[PDB]
Design a protein around this ligand. Structure first.
Ligand SMILES: [Zn+2]
Length: 197
């Protein structure tokens, strides 16, 4: 009833990486290592790097799923709010209820789990291109953390799982996400709150 969030590099040394985008007021996506928390604007590109020590087999996939971070909300499916699920902003592939989309990957598949009702988006894992040391998935988050009737100010985590062709676990990593109007200011504020604490 609750997806695991335990970090697990597995046999391939799987882990995420994030760009260093800074905290200017204009920044649209920024990652705080101190908080393990991505701050992003609504529906903007969030680059998430996938790092491995060795190449996983053909047919490996990479799944993203959101859960509520607070234990008392963890059994509730994270979904878009009653406004955004009805705003007809379909990309033609993502169901309108799904918070997390993958940008620019026609092989993305969106799952409504028939048992847990949780949403996820999964893409094939690809080896890095020539001259690159990792691959990158571009995610979009389609509601604000503050959306009433949806996340409703509750923090979420994104869990990224590396899976084999059957969906079995090969690796797992995760990060908190805040979807907000001013990620740069919010990252600065939360890092300051962490330093003061
Ligand atoms: Zn919303």
């Amino acid at each position: 009833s609750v997806p695991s969030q335990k970090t697990y590099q597995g046999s391939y040394g799987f882990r995420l990486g994030f760009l260093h985008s800074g905290t200017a007021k204009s920044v649209t996506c920024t990652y705080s290592p101190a908080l393990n928390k991505l701050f992003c604007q609504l529906a903007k590109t969030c680059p998430v790097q996938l790092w491995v020590d060795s190449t996983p087999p053909p047919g490996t996939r990479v799944r993203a799923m959101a859960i509520y971070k607070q234990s008392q909300h963890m059994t509730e499916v994270v979904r878009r709010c009653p406004h955004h699920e009805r705003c007809s902003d379909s990309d033609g592939l993502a169901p309108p209820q799904h918070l997390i989309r993958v940008e620019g990957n026609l092989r993305a598949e969106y799952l409504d789990d028939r048992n847990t009702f949780r949403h996820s988006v999964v893409v094939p894992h690809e080896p890095p291109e020539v001259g690159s040391d990792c691959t990158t998935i571009h995610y979009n988050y389609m509601c604000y953390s503050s959306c009433m009737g949806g996340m409703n100010r509750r923090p979420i985590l994104t869990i990224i799982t590396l899976e084999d062709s059957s969906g079995n676990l090969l690796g797992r990593d995760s990060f908190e996400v805040r979807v907000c109007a001013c990620p740069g200011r919010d990252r600065r504020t939360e890092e300051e709150n962490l330093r003061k604490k």
